[PDB]
Amino acid sequence: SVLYQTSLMSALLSGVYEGSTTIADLLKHGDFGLGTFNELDGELIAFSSQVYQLRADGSARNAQPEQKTPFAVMTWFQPQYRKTFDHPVSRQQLHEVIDQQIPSDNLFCALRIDGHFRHAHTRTVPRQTPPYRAMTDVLDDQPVFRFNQREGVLVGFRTPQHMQGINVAGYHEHFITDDRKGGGHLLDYQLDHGVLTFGEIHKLMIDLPADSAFLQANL
Amino acid sequence: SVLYQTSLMSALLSGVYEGSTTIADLLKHGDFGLGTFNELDGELIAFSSQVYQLRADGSARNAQPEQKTPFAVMTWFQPQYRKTFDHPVSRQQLHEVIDQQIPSDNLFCALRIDGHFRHAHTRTVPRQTPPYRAMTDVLDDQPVFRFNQREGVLVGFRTPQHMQGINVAGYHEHFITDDRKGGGHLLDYQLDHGVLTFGEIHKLMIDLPADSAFLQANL
Ligand SMILES: [Cl-]
Ligand SMILES: [Cl-]
Ligand SMILES: [Zn+2]
Ligand SMILES: [Zn+2]
């Protein structure tokens, strides 16, 4: 298993909000992952090669193969572990299960949950036009959506602290509903019951783009 | 071209001085590069699939395929640029030639020089036994070797500042003499005349080990 990363979080945060990488290009290096759309028009969630666009209004829709991303992380998901929960468990409790099984912070984890969420709180970036506001100011203004008692899918990664420059350090998780019409970037959640699958990943490929914005960015 | 990195500089600097990766394993992902030997017994230089061990006494010898490394960076060298110097040029002048041609700090460069060095100043780490002294104290005690008016080969990489956690930020260059009996990790040099070949690299593969020392290291 290889975590295949398109560009750098530092480049995204510097104001490089467009890339030439398509959703079809992402699915060449995985069936599973997360990322951002061109102009920061929400974020993607991918699992079993199905890709959805999650937008700031709490909506999900099928991603089109031609859509472009300035940043993404994909893998061929090959989980080594399965745990079924018949009783409610919080996000932080689920992370403790994963951290106990993969206690080295120096490895990546990929995690998926299929089940019934008591709640799933989401906040997703809206489409930006330059000159760009500070990301923290954009997030202050974005409403949180609260999915209550919903069946759905969670996709996430755990990133080592030794990667903080390059990627989201810690857990990054996205959510989509069973009907695939709702979801977002997760702030917190509680699983009422469902199945966790996850695995460790030892290999990271970083693919730096050629666009002039990336090349001329100050990192 | 892919820069293939075995482990992390942060893990090496934390005191993880042994890996299970062999020189033969390194040559599976390149013909060119740099790295460190188990127990920090000097450093390797590799070019056209020839690999040499450079030790603290200023000696070079052929590396054996079974020797192990805790850290290395290798590539299939595919230079896009060639410049011949008929007149003396310093290391810092040569770097200016490369930086002008590949002005984005956000890309990697691989560089090779074949030619006659006015001087090549080297300092190479000696074999360490735990408990380990601070790397800065070890370097303070290591003599500098000065190669004067020698034909030889330089191998090096330029690492983006956006990678400082993971790798040597900036230029990392090693030197070996024509007779392959002398060389080391370069501090400074001047080329009297010779040929520079170099290329940009957009892709980095980081391969994290499984040994308990790496997994239990604090990074
Ligand atoms: Cl709620
Ligand atoms: Cl000298
Ligand atoms: Zn997200
Ligand atoms: Zn060196």
Identify all chain B residues contacting A219, using CB atoms and an 8 Å cutoff: 105-106, 160-162
Task: Report how far ligand 2's centroid is from the alpha carbon of B41 (Å).
Answer: 25
- Identify the burial level of B136 via C-beta atoms within 10 angstroms of its C-beta, where 0-12 means exposed, 13-18 middle and 19 or more buried: exposed
Identify all chain B residues contacting A208, using CB atoms and an 8 Å cutoff: 106-107, 202-204
Q: What is the CA radius of gyration of chain A?
A: 16
Strand ranges, E, within chain B: 2-6, 21-22, 32-36, 43-47, 50-54, 60-62, 68-69, 71-75, 81-85, 89-90, 108-122, 145-159, 170-177, 183-201, 203-207
CB contact under 8 A, A219 and B106: yes
Method used for this model? X-ray
- Cα–Cα distance for residue pair B58/B16, rounded to 1 Å: 24
Task: Report how far ligand 1's centroid is from the alpha carbon of A12 (Å).
Answer: 30
CB A36 within 8 A of CB A69: yes
Q: Token pair for residue A134?
A: 């500070």
Determine how many CB atoms are found less than 10 A away from the CB of residue A53: 20
β-pair type (B2-6, B203-207): parallel
Which among A101, A94, A93 is positioned nearest to A199, based on CA atoms?
A101
Question: What is the nearest CA distance from B147 to chain A, expressed in angstroms?
Answer: 37
- Cα–Cα distance for residue pair A54/A31, rounded to 1 Å: 17
- Cα–Cα distance for residue pair A36/B90, rounded to 1 Å: 44
Residues 46-105 of A with CB under 8 A from B: 104-105
Determine how many CB atoms are found less than 10 A away from the CB of residue B216: 12
- Cα–Cα distance for residue pair A173/A5, rounded to 1 Å: 16
CB contact under 8 A, B219 and A161: yes
- How far is residue B126 from each of residues A122, B27, B53, measured CA to CA in Å? 53, 24, 12
Ligand approaching nearest to the C-alpha of A149: 1
CB contact under 8 A, B202 and A210: yes
Task: Report how far ligand 1's centroid is from the alpha carbon of B97 (Å).
Answer: 59
CB A116 within 8 A of CB A86: no
> Closest residue of A to B102, CA-based?
A215
- How far is residue B197 from each of residues A150, A207, A210, B100, B144, measured CA to CA in Å? 59, 23, 21, 14, 27
Q: Determine phi and psi for A180, rounding to 5 degrees.
A: 65, 25
DSSP per-residue codes, B105-153 = TTSEEEEEEEEEEEEEEE--PPP--SSPPPHHHHHHHSPPEEEEEEEEE
Q: Determine phi and psi for A77, rounding to 5 degrees.
A: -65, 120
- How far is residue B6 from each of residues A73, B12, B23, B74, B162, measured CA to CA in Å? 20, 11, 11, 9, 18
Buried b (16+ CB within 10 A) or exposed e, A208-218: bbebeebbebe
- Cα–Cα distance for residue pair B176/B182, rounded to 1 Å: 6
Q: Tell me if chain B has a CB within 8 Å of the CB of A215.
A: yes
Q: CA B64, B69, B74: angle at the middle one, nearest 5? A: 90
Which among A184, A132, A166 is positioned nearest to A15, based on CA atoms?
A132
Q: Tell me if chain B has a CB within 8 Å of the CB of A206.
A: yes
CB contact under 8 A, B106 and A202: no
Q: Tell me if chain A has a CB within 8 Å of the CB of B28.
A: no
Residues in chain B: 219
CATH 3.30.1330.80, domain B78-200, yes or no: yes
| Cis before A130 (ω within 30) | no
Q: Token pair for residue A164?
A: 């903080």
Question: What is the nearest CA distance from A156 to chain B, expressed in angstroms?
Answer: 20
Task: Report how far ligand 3's centroid is from the alpha carbon of B148 (Å).
Answer: 56
Question: Among B10, B104, B204, whose Cβ lies nearest the Cβ of A162?
Answer: B10
DSSP β-bridge partners for residue A70: none
Domain edges within chain B = 1-77+201-219, 78-200
β-pair type (B145-159, B108-122): antiparallel
Q: CA A163, A168, A170: angle at the middle one, nearest 5? A: 80
H or E element in which residue B100 lies:
helix B91-101
CB B12 within 8 A of CB B70: yes
Strand ranges, E, within chain A: 2-6, 21-22, 32-36, 43-47, 50-54, 60-62, 68-69, 71-75, 81-85, 89-90, 108-122, 145-159, 170-177, 183-201, 203-207
Determine how many CB atoms are found less than 10 A away from the CB of residue A154: 25
Q: Token pair for residue B165?
A: 């956690």
CB contact under 8 A, A162 and B8: yes
CB A163 within 8 A of CB A157: no
Task: Report how far ligand 1's centroid is from the alpha carbon of A154 (Å).
Answer: 16
* Chain centroid to CA B52: 11
Q: Tell me if chain A has a CB within 8 Å of the CB of B202.
A: yes
SS3 B214: helix
Mutate to test the interface with B, among A9, A208, A211, A215 (most CBs of B within 10 A): A208
Q: Tell me if chain A has a CB within 8 Å of the CB of B206.
A: yes
CB contact under 8 A, B105 and A206: no
Determine how many CB atoms are found less than 10 A away from the CB of residue A115: 18
CB B185 within 8 A of CB B54: yes
CB contact under 8 A, B203 and A206: yes
